[PDB]
Ligand SMILES: NC(=O)C1=CN([C@@H]2O[C@H](COP(=O)(O)OP(=O)(O)OC[C@H]3O[C@@H](n4cnc5c(N)ncnc54)[C@H](OP(=O)(O)O)[C@@H]3O)[C@@H](O)[C@H]2O)C=CC1
């Protein structure tokens with residue numbers, strides 16, 4: 001159980017390296033160390049800025065013969081200012097150029113939120129999203145072979161279903177926050193009903209992000225299962241997601257933990273311990289405050305997540 005199968009037929013590696021908040025030079029060595037440790041899945045985004053760095057790590061891996069391009073699952077993401085249909089493929093070509101790849105394995109709409117091209121997230125830059133029109137342009141990138149799969153990120157059940165209803169090419173993935181403290185049961189059920197894969201971001205509760213306030217790995221339920229099974233809390237957290245049928249993007253810079261985050265395959269969480277996850281209090285850690293605003297199409301956090309708060 002080291003892969004999940006997308007609705008296009010392609011296999012996605014269950015564990016990928018998260019690369020948000022990986023700084024100058026830090027991310028390249030993390031991509032390199034993770035791939036030689038055995039990672040076959042790297043999750044990127046243009047808005048993180050580090051795609052050039054990531055490209056150089058991948059080019060080095062290929063030159064040293066650690067992997068071939070086809071061995072790797074590479075994801076990047078369309079940022080909120082490129083939602084206009086003619087801007088979408090141009091944004092993909094830029095991400096491709098910087099990563100020095102001919103194709104991505106997965107290309108995601110980063111947020112269901114739009115701003116004018118080349119502007120920052122501030123209320124005068126807000127444009128009302130037109131996700132069907134953006135998706136139409138994502139589909140042409142898929143048809144042109146530039147993205148083997150397309151999908152979305154931070155889409156609620158309602159919003160994912162709204163897109164499925166109008167789409168020709170179904171979103172392959174909804175990449176959302178998902179971890180023992182935010183288990184996404186509703187969206188998980190809805191993804192199984194539609195054939196959409198769910199990738200968990202912040203699978204550890206993102207313990208190092210200041211403003212999120214993450215203590216997922218200190219939950220007594222996780223610490224206990226960790227002791228009873230001989231594993232770290234982080235391993236038990238990632239395993240929980242994998243056992244739910246979710247891929248996971250642990251972000252890390254420490255080589256020891258990068259390899260620990262891959263040891264989630266050949267052992268199980270028993271049914272009797274697994275049921276105890278129902279006893280973990282639930283709080284969404286990444287609320288999306290930066291796009292909830294009296295002038296945004298989302299005026300409340302409820303409007304952004306469609307009650308999935
Ligand atoms: N909107 C979107 O689509 C979003 C996508 N993402 C993606 O998902 C990825 C993961 O989310 P992220 O917020 O990075 O948080 P994670 O849940 O992956 O946790 C990250 C933090 O946990 C620490 N950590 C890593 N491994 C371990 C371990 N074995 N034990 C204890 N602590 C550990 C890391 O520090 P250290 O480096 O020192 O190990 C880091 O501070 C991102 O990198 C990004 O690619 C993230 C946010 C939003």
Ligand SMILES: [Co+2]
Pocket residue numbers: 164167168170
């Ligand atoms: Co259909």
